[PDB]
Design a binder for this molecule. Sequence first.
Ligand code: 1PP
Length: 337
Amino acid sequence: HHHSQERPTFYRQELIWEVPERYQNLSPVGSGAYGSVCAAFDTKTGLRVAVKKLSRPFQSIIHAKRTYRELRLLKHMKHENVIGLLDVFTPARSLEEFNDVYLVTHLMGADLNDHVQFLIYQILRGLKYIHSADIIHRDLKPSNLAVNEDCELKILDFGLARHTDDEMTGYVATRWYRAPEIMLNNQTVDIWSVGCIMAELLTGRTLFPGTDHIDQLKLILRLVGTPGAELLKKISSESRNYIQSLTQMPKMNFANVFIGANPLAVDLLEKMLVLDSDKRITAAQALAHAYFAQYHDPDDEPVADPYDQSFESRDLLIDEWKSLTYDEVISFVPPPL
Ligand SMILES: CC(C)(C)c1cc(NC(=O)Nc2cccc(Cl)c2Cl)n(-c2ccccc2)n1
């Protein structure tokens, strides 16, 4: 139980959104099987916002756990370079009516598809924090990075679509950013994604635009070379055979792929796009790279509070996922304005 369940504030428009009256000028910006997002203006704060209506949130156990997972995640994220919950709400007046979940954050200028140094810095700073609470993103791409007027950035995950091999969001494949260990076979799988993003920011074009999985690898290997002895041993799936059988190609001079770029940037990209994930540079290491010397401050790059995700192992009924989420909705307190 919550104030709003006594305050007749909810109105209804089809776009079928029931939201408090503080939230006006709703405007669709994206949709999928898992929910919808509108921009809107909040008359209470005076600022512009986004709102996600989860779709049929307690209809299946997938949706139900997923709903709870996202809300728990966003309620924990308190970092400038990570999406933060401004509000969570439901038209429900009690648990018996609790059927829809709505989350509210800042609307940041647009998204992404010395400004590159600043953006990348911000991405890694947010990634250090995500990774420190033992969350891997898994789907970093330009459309999951929101930016404002001042090139001030926030990592997010729209999460509207079912994750599939051939997934698409606008005119971009998800596989273009996939760490090749996933595609084929640690937390640095996000770092692979970061490096492909930084390449795109420097050149204006996609680093690895594969048609399909074999094309993608050939394009990756074209850039960074075929694997050495050590990486091959660590690949546990015998069919290892396939990449070992590939004619050895030499890594390119990254300097002449990224013509004119800061030498430091090119050096950082090399340390990001290493095939062997035990040797790829981590978010915390990469912030201390000299490329960011004008932004780096280790003490203003915090890690997260311990994140209790013991729920991930639990086999719960839908209604327990629902009732666990209800508590989280009803106890949500907005961040200090
Ligand atoms: C912490 C991080 C890993 C970056 C993350 C962030 C999100 N969720 C989001 O980014 N959600 C989101 C995106 C755009 C606009 C709006 Cl209003 C929302 Cl609520 N999720 C998420 C979790 C579970 C399902 C879907 C999304 N995960």
